[PDB]
Specification:
Layout lengths: L11 E5 L7 H15 L4 E6 L4 E6 L7 H10 L2 E7 L6 H13 L3 E7 L9 H15 L9 E3 L11 H16 L12 E3 L2 E5 L3 E7 L5 E2 L3 E6 L2 E7 L11 E2 L4 E7 L11 E3 L6 E9 L20 E3 L7 E4 L14 E11 L5 E6 L2 E11 L2
The chain binds kirromycin and guanosine-5'-diphosphate.
The structure holds one RNA strand.
Catalytic activity: GTP + H2O = GDP + phosphate + H(+)
Subcellular location: Cytoplasm; Cell inner membrane
InterPro entries: EF-Tu_GTP-bd, EF-Tu_GTPase, EFTu-like_2, EFTU_2, G_TR_CS, P-loop_NTPase, Small_GTP-bd, T_Tr_GTP-bd_dom
RNA sequence: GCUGGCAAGCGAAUGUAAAGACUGACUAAGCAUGUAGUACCGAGGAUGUAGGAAUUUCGGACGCGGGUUCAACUCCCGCCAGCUCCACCA
């Protein structure tokens, strides 16, 4: 809160969701150190590339942390698959790539650690070919993707070769990730993802601005679980730096006045007044396929109670279908009505995720609202 | 049925009552194929192998949902209702 941030080199979000205990934290720390040297839980570090300013999100690679990882990847603009070159693909890596494809991460860069732990020039190529084949078979891009090999912990050790290699890694990261599209057309909207309580400052809510801008001193409305209320913003900041306005697409922390830590939970949205209204039941078309798209095999019936993940959080919901469909067997391209317990401010065209038993069943697009 | 040959009175003895074949227009009365009928049932005949009565039970409900030992009413998971532990300072 002592640095006046300059809105140059537009913000781009990059997230590392690589394999567990394969060097994600070490890799991001090494990247930050080498960039700050040559240029002068979800860990949100930042670094200013000469091309663009990036915010690096090291997400937890644990399966049980998938719920917050969903927002971390939806938050994310470019994925970094961090994997060891001595073990190759893993079930955890496959789950992570499936989640990334289901959340819609366009650009992914593969990094191969433990390059020097292997005294050969064929095993590294074999594992690179294997991961490339995995990407090409799991609906991912192919030979037009920069694949990065090298050591993630020696990048911090005194060297020159690996420093140059990681600098080249950062270069094509910023090359392969062009200027992203921002949605500052509609009024301001920001889904909440974390809450902090600053002693002497107050409560601050973190998140990626979905749309619109936030000027210092603007009135906004909290809409979400069990509550729709009003508030005032004072002191827009980003990564402990002074800001003047907050564009859309970057993870920022907005300071709210008259906010209670227990009263405000994750799942709500800070919108412009009179824009969106929370609803508990709405009509949506489902896009489940027969068997090979996450959906189950046996022809289940009504009363299904899945979690409907949204931009922020999820909630257990019920589904009702119009007459003409005796069963709700997988293969549901039809429209139905979904009722949720916790009301969340929603708009037409919203894309949500249907999940159950730790696996995604199908997608859904909001068609109408029944309040 | 009027008549039909005549006895019987015109108010007397007092009546055999078969009704199928054959020609053809057939789409019964333009118009597709005909000599007995493929229709229509309703108290005329039959199904009784399967669905209705009893009779063994499958179905359910211990929070729901389902991929689970079927013996599930906690044999595998995601939630939600409480207890605890921390991560958690734009
Ligand atoms: C994943 C949960 C959270 C997502 C959040 C929301 O997802 C979304 O609502 C999203 C809507 C598009 C959503 O609902 N996703 C969540 C739910 C739905 C899932 C989406 C997308 C899919 O389409 C039916 C999606 C995989 C789709 O398959 C296509 C190809 C198939 C790939 C293979 C893998 C699959 C499945 C598979 O079963 C499979 C296999 O076949 C062989 C081997 N092993 C496998 O395991 C293509 O790759 C498309 O991408 C939006 O992206 C929102 O922006 C969001 C981020 C708020
Ligand atoms: N030998 C070797 N070890 C590595 C390399 N990259 C990462 N590591 C190991 O990975 C560990 C760091 O794991 P960490 O990032 O904290 O786990 P994660 O966050 O779940 O990915 C370190 O102890 C390193 O020994 C590498 O290139 N070579």
């Amino acid at each position: 809160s002592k640095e006046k941030f300059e809105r140059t080199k537009p913000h781009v979000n990059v997230g590392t969701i690589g394999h567990v205990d394969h060097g994600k934290t070490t890799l991001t720390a090494a990247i930050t150190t080498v960039l700050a040297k040559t240029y002068g839980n979800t860990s949100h570090v930042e670094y200013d590339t000469p091309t663009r300013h990036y915010a690096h999100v090291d997400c937890p690679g644990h399966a049980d942390y998938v719920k917050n990882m969903i927002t971390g990847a939806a938050q994310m603009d470019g994925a970094i698959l961090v994997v060891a070159a001595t073990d190759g693909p893993m079930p955890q890596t496959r789950e992570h790539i499936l989640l990334g494809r289901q959340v819609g991460v366009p650009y992914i860069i593969v990094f191969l650690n433990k390059c020097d732990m292997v005294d050969d020039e064929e095993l590294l190529e074999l594992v690179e070919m294997e991961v490339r084949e995995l990407l090409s078979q799991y609906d991912f891009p192919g030979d037009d993707t920069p694949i990065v090999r090298g050591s993630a912990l020696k990048a911090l050790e005194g060297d020159a070769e690996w420093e140059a290699k990681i600098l080249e890694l950062a270069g094509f990261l910023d090359s392969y990730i062009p200027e992203p599209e921002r949605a500052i057309d509609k009024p301001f909207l920001l889904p909440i993802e974390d809450v902090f309580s600053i002693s002497g400052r107050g409560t601050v809510v973190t998140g990626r601005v979905e749309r619109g801008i936030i000027k210092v001193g603007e009135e906004v409305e909290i809409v979400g679980i069990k509550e729709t209320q009003k508030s005032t913003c004072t002191g827009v900041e980003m990564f402990r730096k002074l800001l003047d306005e907050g564009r859309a697409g970057e993870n920022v922390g907005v300071l709210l006045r008259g906010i209670k830590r227990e009263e405000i939970e994750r799942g709500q949205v800070l919108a412009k007044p009179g824009t969106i209204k929370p609803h508990t039941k709405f009509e949506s078309e489902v896009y489940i396929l027969s068997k090979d798209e996450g959906g189950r095999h046996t022809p289940f019936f009504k009363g299904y109670r899945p979690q409907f993940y949204f931009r922020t959080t999820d909630v257990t919901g019920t589904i009702e279908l119009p007459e003409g469909v005796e069963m709700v067997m997988p293969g549901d391209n039809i429209k139905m009505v979904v009722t949720l317990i916790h009301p969340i401010a929603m708009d037409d065209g919203l894309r949500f995720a249907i999940r159950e038993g730790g696996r995604t069943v199908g997608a859904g697009v909001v068609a109408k609202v029944l309040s």
